[model samples]
Target chain A: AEALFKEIDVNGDGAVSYEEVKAFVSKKRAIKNEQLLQLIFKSIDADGNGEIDQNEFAKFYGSIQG
Target chain B: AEALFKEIDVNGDGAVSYEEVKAFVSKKRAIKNEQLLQLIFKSIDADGNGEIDQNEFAKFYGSIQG
Candidate 1:
């Protein structure tokens, strides 16, 4: 529907520049990327959730990224 | 299941309002208008070569109602 939207560029070259959305999304949330890292680490580190009932926790933590 | 987010009306009475996200998402960046709002609702295409890639990704214009 908005093909020309991207193709034609409503605001044209300078308007929707790469930084706009990249910067905008980053600007608005002000979310910390490190928080996500912590969440993944803690989640696996605590090794809670469903898998805890089975056995140990850390092996799964290692499974995530290590 | 967390809080049943749908009930909360950033939507506010189908009225032209905020403002929660509007205030935060727009007010500071100075976007505070339909352009940013419009992009949210409509910006889905890659508007990637665009960052805002999809031309219409944020539109729903009045959702945040300046």
Candidate 2:
């Protein structure tokens, strides 16, 4: 989470916006659909607070491999 | 391919049905996503015959490890 968070938070503002998340994930994988990106953003933003944090990202990222 | 085909062909009818492939992967992994299962099925049924014989199965199964 820490490592990915750094990369995703491209502007280094300490939190991840949808754009940041979208850019990072799109670069890392093949999420070609806008809906899929929205779905992923929603899932990663576990609190529904419109922004993603390290903890939420950690859970989602870890779950992918498991 | 040989080993997995035997196990997946539960009916012993010489060809593996969709349900058998579905059941095997469904048991072997946690696929909470329906799109993934559909994608897997389509990819495995390479001959486009709607059902998987041993030959179609091997190509996809081999591709997984690649």
Candidate 3:
């Protein structure tokens, strides 16, 4: 996860909010659409807090294992 | 996979050792990193082993949706 992309959730609310995702938007070169953002956001919101959280961190982490 | 990078390339060895990772990098954010490390490590260690095997770890790296 550290290498794939840094956690966009700066607040540490156990989830990543839409606002936090801006960090990611800037870093990823190919990601330029809502679909990818939606998928990525879902992964960050571990507790389903309508934002990204630490729990969902696994989703992205495991996802990269693909 | 914050630890994802740790598992794959900590020490720049081209592979991560369980001992090297999010935890090893910095202890600044204790509470956040603790859980973050747990989730990240769990994603890599599919077999429930304490340490992540190379295969399970590589599975994530191979997949790049972008």
Candidate 4:
């Protein structure tokens, strides 16, 4: 979780914004829909503060395992 | 998000339990702390229903990209 968070949080602001998430997911993952991406971004930004904290990222990171 | 949910939901019950999550993360990811793992699971299970449904999982899934 720590590694993934650091990688995604390009600015090292200790949190990931929607732009950072979108850029990373679009380039690395296969998701292409802007609407779905927005929904996903909103979902991760649990508090709707427009960013994903380490704890929140951990919850998502812990789930998407093999 | 849909594909990830299918993989985590081992029982195909349309949700993910702590047990299933533990097994997957322990083997695939590097989280070894049981308590931390519980916390992550608890965070995802927003409704305290002992499991994460599609909606909950989707929010998490959307956050950890790139």
Candidate 5:
């Protein structure tokens, strides 16, 4: 999990910002709608801190199974 | 999201039972740890109904990216 977190934390700043997340998402699929992208970012940014720390992301990532 | 939900809900009974989800996950990734699998299912089954309805799954599936 720690390794996975590090990989997502592209800036190596110990946390993932919304822009980083959006970039990551775009690599896999294009989210053309800005509103939908923000909604996705809002949902992941559970702490409302404008960033997704490892703990918050861990909670979200653990529920990734279909 | 509706299409994705229906694909996961193989039984097609509206609500996606845990078995259906587990089967779907196993098809994509090998969840060898039983406890971990249970934890994933519990997190997705947010309503504690032992099943993942479309709404529950929509919230979960929407957060799938890294």
Candidate 6:
């Protein structure tokens, strides 16, 4: 309940962003590497708050089944 | 700036998920086993939404360097 997400939010910004998300995915997808810090930020900033909260994080992340 | 983070969101729910995790981890990351995956998933789901978001992804992944 706790540890799983803590692992995801690498920056410990109290929220997760695209840069952290992509790095994990790229590594899995076998992609070489590219800067995606902004992409992550933009993805979760639904309200354009320039930041994300737990609610936003849940729906977006919860969407994933596997 | 874009390519890297998207790679992490393998399931592409606009956020990272536990199921997408194994696939996203670098082949080199060498997860211990299925339980390790569970452990990781448990680590990142901070708000108990049963999922992770970009903010969570950032704070978490940002912790990893290489």
Fnat score for model 1 = 0.30
Model 1 - which docking category?
incorrect
Error of 3 at A39 (Å): 34
| Residue lDDT tens for model 2, A11-58 | 999999999988887876754554465675676567786654445544
Q: Encode model 3's per-residue lDDT on B1-66: one tens digit a residue.
A: 666664446467766666655555555466575566567656655777554433553465645321
User: Pairing residues by index, what is the TM-score of model 3?
Assistant: 0.27
CA deviation > 4 Å runs, candidate 1: A1-20, A27-33, A47-57, A61-66, B1-66
Superposition TM-score, candidate 1 onto the true structure: 0.22
lDDT of 5 by residue, B1-66 (tens): 998899899988999999989898887564455455567667866768665444554566534731
Clashes of 2: 0
- Report the C-alpha lDDT of model 6 over A1-66, residue by residue, as the tens digit: 257556656777565444555466557456433336566667777788888888768767755521
Worst 10 residues of 4 chain A by lDDT: A14-23
- Backbone collisions counted per model: 26, 0, 20, 0, 0, 45
TM-score of chain B of each: 0.18, 0.41, 0.48, 0.46, 0.46, 0.42
Question: Which segments of model 3 are wrong by more than 4 Å?
Answer: A1-66, B1-28, B63-66
Which model, 2 or 6, shows the larger TM-score?
6
RMSD of each: 15.2, 18.7, 20.7, 21.6, 21.4, 20.2
lDDT of 4 at A13: 64
- Tens digits of per-residue lDDT, candidate 2, B7-32, equal 75677766444456556656666645
Question: Candidate 5, clashing residue pairs?
Answer: none
Provide the global lDDT of candidate 3 against the true structure.
Answer: 0.54
User: How much of the true A–B contact set does each candidate keep?
Assistant: 0.30, 0.00, 0.00, 0.00, 0.00, 0.22
Candidate 1 at A26: error in angstroms? 4.0
After aligning candidate 5 to the native by TM-score, how far in Å is the CA of B6 from where it should be? 47
| Candidate 1 global CA lDDT score | 0.46
DockQ of each: 0.13, 0.02, 0.03, 0.02, 0.02, 0.11
Q: How far off is residue A20 in model 3, in Å?
A: 28
**Mind giving the per-residue lDDT tens digits that candidate 1 earns over B24-61?**
45544665554675565344433334434332443522
